[PDB]
Write a protein that binds this ligand. Structure first.
Ligand SMILES: Nc1ncnc2c1ncn2[C@@H]1O[C@H](COS(=O)(=O)NC(=O)[C@@H](N)CO)[C@@H](O)[C@H]1O
Ligand SMILES: Nc1ncnc2c1ncn2[C@@H]1O[C@H](COS(=O)(=O)NC(=O)[C@@H](N)CO)[C@@H](O)[C@H]1O
Ligand SMILES: [Pt+2]
Ligand SMILES: [Pt+2]
Ligand SMILES: [Pt+2]
Ligand SMILES: [Pt+2]
Ligand SMILES: [Pt+2]
Ligand SMILES: [Pt+2]
Ligand SMILES: [Pt+2]
Ligand SMILES: [Pt+2]
Ligand SMILES: [Pt+2]
Ligand SMILES: [Pt+2]
Ligand SMILES: [Pt+2]
Ligand SMILES: [Pt+2]
Ligand SMILES: [Pt+2]
Ligand SMILES: [Pt+2]
Ligand SMILES: [Pt+2]
Ligand SMILES: [Pt+2]
Ligand SMILES: [Pt+2]
Ligand SMILES: [Pt+2]
Ligand SMILES: [Pt+2]
Ligand SMILES: [Pt+2]
Ligand SMILES: [Pt+2]
Ligand SMILES: [Pt+2]
Ligand SMILES: [Pt+2]
Ligand SMILES: [Pt+2]
Ligand SMILES: [Pt+2]
Ligand SMILES: [Pt+2]
Ligand SMILES: [Zn+2]
Ligand SMILES: [Zn+2]
Lengths: 527, 527
RNA sequence: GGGAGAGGUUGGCCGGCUGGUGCCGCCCCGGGACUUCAAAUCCCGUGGGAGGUCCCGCAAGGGAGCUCCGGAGGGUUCGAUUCCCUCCCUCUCCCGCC
RNA sequence: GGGAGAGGUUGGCCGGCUGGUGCCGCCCCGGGACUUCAAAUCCCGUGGGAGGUCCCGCAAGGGAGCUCCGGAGGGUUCGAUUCCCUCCCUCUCCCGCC
């Protein structure tokens, strides 16, 4: 892919000028610039920058400057500015007050067939033209900030990526085919065929909440949840010696950005905006509310105006605060490993659609284990964790498989292929549990993931600038257990009649709850 | 306050007309309308509507119609429309195609001195003029929807309220002076003077999280939190027989509206917007992200565009899902009372300011008790709950007071004075705990509220349309314990050295955690 | 089960009429006139539902008035109870099924 | 502690000069010329820091080149090492404090 730049540069002189007196100097400069300055740094076989033309108006000198990857037009402009202004200053007592790039054009010549639909959306350009297997990108009024931040450079990288069809996902990193079953519990005799959501709605173990994806869990359901969770903490989390933590469920949009998670699933998160400072805006709002007496376009639009820009996301990962914890810190193997868990609250995923599954919800509860160590140690914690969980699933008499996770959570986007970092051969494993009411065991939709076990390699260690004293390689990982999910699976397999639930569960129910609590019936509702 | 309406009404005839042929009919109608129709329903001593003038253009008949509270101009317009169109239809073969109110004016004559600053912001009017102790409100282009919804009526109510200076808060409902101490634990000998936030930051029992108002709680802190919470659940919640529930922490803006809570604290909540459906918007976004390589005005603004209108608030009350549960349901005393609690997760309050207190945070943990019963029973649950809590505070060897709560949470706004409903003499009580490091016990800022105990009267029962079979009066109430707060108070009083903590706490720490966990130190951080 | 026919109000699963904002008969209810009483006779209808507004009452509640409803929604028209379209529903017939 | 004075580089807490994009002397480093060797002598300076770009190398890393830095920030000017303002900091003096 040949790549060629052309810029319209404008040098604004300190005062008006009579060009005829100036040109002699510009001509001389330009000629010697093309010969020397704009060939400097260019490798022997290649082309640099040339000032292709110039002209002098009363305020300005206008230049056509062309470039190559070896020397780019604005870098050229930089080399020219300071110099041509010293000459102008010495010869004519005139400087260059400002320098601007009204038009900056880049042409990418392809061997591949290209058309608009191949390219797609091009983020920063004012024009995109595709012709003759060529992409002409034009940028108006280019800031020094764009240039410093290599914004155009990345646009180019993008357009290349978009044309080369790299977007087809077998192109992705994981070494082992997802779906691949590492481990299996053979089938248990099949004890319950009932539909957990429908049955739970029936008996009112959940009542549907007004918001999409959400539910109210009434006491029998909640008692199950409590002990199920407590039993998980006892058998796995606490047994493997993870120490407790309280992590924020409200996560700064910038933490999301550092993780690259924002790049990955921007459409699967909820966004959160806080209120503006000025208390009178809300005095006024309160007034609009009273007068309209409802939420409508007017009041709801007026609400938006009193809000700030979105600065947070309701936490989907559930492990984020941990990288903020280690951020910019330096570790010693005597301080390693670090193993924390958090069971504080609800974790959110926005899925659009019929939200009607109890097995897939927007608001869920999970135990998040999180850890950092040298990578041999790093991968063992995940192994132990898996073995730990397998044993629990057995104690809960559940049918389960462990398979290679289909996609990395923090990998769920692509062009991040831009960096370079050390990654595990198998980033993510899923602990799946069979739900009989969904179909025969062969069917992948009859299994839900009740937990994911991930080694991250160096990914977050890098973005959060976590280092080791020596400089040893550091790895992180997280595992988490959707307890909401484990509950559904327990019901799906063992059914709703409590005396047929697993032993450790009955005991927990009885001791803490004195029997399985009953639905808070009304006359109308439970039905 | 005398009140007088004048409307410019426009009746649009089905076809163009030659007025001279029409006027004879309009004149006749108008004269008889003023005599009969527009005096109907008006009480004997009072004024109705009059059509003060009319004129006929080629498409339209224009009318000046004036009114009083007894008969308002548009009601007049309604009485006129159907009738004048039957006559026009019979005499001229012409109907009234549409009817509009381009200008609708209301004048409120006051005896009180009024100026603009008294009135303040007037929500729906296109003009407000104050002169000669008079407020002229003008509405352009008035929809039938405004009229149906009595929007203007409430504007008037408002402007009256705003002038009558009712806004000064001694005007508020609570019978007993807030601050009033119902009950007290005499001073304990004073065992620790240290500053809990500063000390905790020092030893790294919390690390500061990037977002305003938030923190990471590391294992010793979290272990304390876990057992403290578990001990509360054992001694109060579970002892008084509250049954467990899982309540949504993400609350629909409409639930907020029904509670009247939105009217109350619109500036103390976080707002949440979900993403738009179209997945390509995010394809595009992902692209803008890569190219800019940062969150900035451009990308952050572009993010806003892919978001929907705010439809939720991060739950500040912590009891909201319960009214959604009972909503539109009918209860039987055999089903009463209903007592649930929820310990699911974080509850949010946006306070703007230096967020540096551990005693006042944006993201906190509390146990929420919630209940419904006949009101004698209703108030007992709160009493029991208080007695329950007092005993716990004693077992935790804390200095505590119970005082009349300064403001109702769901009362935190005003003009809701519009309705009529049965309210307790003392809506809210606070359980306050002494923090030595803040000042001498006399100082109210040295006490924080570790819980609030509220009977709501009929307030939510009404707005959520919860009824009883018989029709007996129903009450609700909630209590909640900020466990975050209880932790700070424990430290504030007993200090950071674990062997000097209360007995039931040590035991809980040892059994579950095998000693008090240690800080996950790095080389740099804990410091 | 498939098909065709008849119908559907605002006291009446009453009958009839009507492109003029609904009318006629009969009955029921309520009220009124006539009057020894009774019955007979005659007049009135703001007779059901739904939602606002205003007045009265501490309250339970009472009164005034207005708009909308003709199975439900939509069309035509100046005007639809009336004509046309869609669905709903009752009632009889044919066909097939035992 | 208060006050006043002197100063502050991009090899040198070296000295001097300079409104022309920095220069002079001396020393140090590196490189080069002259040459029996040594020393002497002469020339060169892209000699420190910071950040991009390009090339090379599997890599550790190597090379080319460009922009910015004269205590830190800002002003004037066509041009600031030089002049002016603000803060920082070193060095001496006076005053007061023992
Ligand atoms: N929508 C959902 N409904 C219920 N549980 C869910 C949902 N999304 C995630 N979970 C639970 O959370 C676990 C982790 O989700 S994950 O995307 O696969 N992996 C992660 O988030 C990792 N960061 C570990 O927390 C799942 O295995 C499941 O147990
Ligand atoms: N910003 C905060 N930081 C810490 N705890 C808080 C905060 N806001 C509220 N709480 C806790 O939550 C309790 C209840 O808050 S409240 O406004 O007073 N009352 C309510 O919210 C009631 N609906 C009961 O939940 C407080 O007493 C305190 O224990
Ligand atoms: Pt090339
Ligand atoms: Pt020159
Ligand atoms: Pt071009
Ligand atoms: Pt520039
Ligand atoms: Pt560039
Ligand atoms: Pt640049
Ligand atoms: Pt891809
Ligand atoms: Pt079943
Ligand atoms: Pt309201
Ligand atoms: Pt390794
Ligand atoms: Pt238990
Ligand atoms: Pt009922
Ligand atoms: Pt009046
Ligand atoms: Pt007429
Ligand atoms: Pt007026
Ligand atoms: Pt209208
Ligand atoms: Pt009105
Ligand atoms: Pt209306
Ligand atoms: Pt008020
Ligand atoms: Pt102290
Ligand atoms: Pt990126
Ligand atoms: Pt009562
Ligand atoms: Pt325990
Ligand atoms: Pt260190
Ligand atoms: Pt009205
Ligand atoms: Pt460059
Ligand atoms: Zn995670
Ligand atoms: Zn509450």
């Amino acid at each position: 892919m040949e790549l060629k730049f052309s810029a319209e540069v404008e040098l604004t002189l300190s005062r008006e000028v009579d060009p005829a007196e100036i040109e002699p100097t510009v001509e001389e400069f330009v000629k010697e610039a093309n010969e020397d300055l704009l060939q400097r740094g260019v490798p022997t076989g290649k082309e640099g920058a040339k000032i292709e033309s110039y002209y002098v108006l009363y305020d300005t000198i206008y230049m056509e400057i062309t470039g190559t990857r070896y020397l780019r037009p604005h870098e050229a402009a930089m080399r020219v500015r300071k110099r041509l202004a010293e000459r102008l200053g010495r010869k004519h007592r005139v400087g260059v007050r400002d320098l601007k790039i009204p038009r900056y054009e880049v042409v990418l010549r392809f061997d591949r067939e290209v058309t608009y639909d191949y390219v797609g959306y091009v983020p920063v350009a004012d024009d995109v033209v595709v012709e003759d297997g060529t992409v002409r990108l034009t940028f108006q009024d280019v800031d020094e900030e764009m240039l410093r931040r290599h914004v155009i450079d990345r646009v180019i990288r993008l357009v290349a990526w978009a044309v080369e069809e790299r977007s087809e996902l077998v192109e992705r990193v994981t070494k082992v085919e997802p779906g691949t079953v590492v481990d299996e519990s053979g089938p248990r005799r099949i004890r319950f065929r009932g539909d957990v959501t429908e049955e739970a709605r029936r008996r009112g173990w959940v009542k549907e909440f007004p918001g999409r994806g959400q539910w109210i869990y009434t006491p029998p359901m909640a008692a199950l949840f409590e002990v199920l969770r407590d039993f998980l903490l006892e058998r796995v989390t606490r047994k493997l010696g993870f120490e407790p933590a309280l992590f924020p469920k409200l996560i700064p949009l910038e933490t999301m950005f550092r993780m690259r998670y924002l790049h990955g699933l921007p459409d699967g998160m909820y966004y959160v905006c806080p209120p503006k400072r000025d208390p009178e805006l809300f005095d006024d709002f309160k007034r609009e509310l009273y007068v309209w007496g409802e939420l409508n376009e007017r009041t709801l639009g007026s609400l938006k105006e009193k809000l700030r820009d979105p600065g947070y996301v309701l936490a989907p990962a559930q492990c984020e605060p941990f990288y903020e914890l280690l951020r910019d810190e330096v570790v010693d193997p005597e301080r390693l490993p670090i193993k924390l868990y958090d069971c504080s609250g609800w974790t959110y995923r926005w899925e659009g659609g019929a939200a009607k599954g109890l097995e897939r919800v927007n608001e869920f509860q999970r135990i998040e284990h999180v850890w950092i160590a040298e990578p041999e140690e790093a991968y063992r914690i995940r192994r132990e964790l898996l073995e730990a969980t397998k044993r629990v699933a057995e104690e809960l008499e559940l049918e389960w498989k462990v398979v290679v996770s289909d996609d990395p959570f923090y990998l769920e986007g692509r062009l991040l292929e831009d960096r370079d970092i050390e990654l595990p051969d198998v980033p993510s494993y899923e602990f799946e549990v069979y739900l009989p009411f969904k179909g025969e065991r062969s069917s992948e939709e009859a299994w839900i993931s009740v937990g994911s076990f991930n080694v991250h390699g160096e990914h977050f260690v890098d973005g959060f600038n976590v280092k080791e004293k020596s400089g040893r390689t550091l790895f992180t990982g997280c595992a988490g257990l959707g307890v909401t999910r484990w509950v559904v699976g327990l019901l799906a397999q063992h059914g709703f009649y409590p005396y047929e639930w697993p032993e450790p569960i009955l005991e927990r129910i009885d001791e803490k709850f004195g029997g399985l609590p009953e639905v808070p019936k009304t006359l109308t509702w439970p039905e």
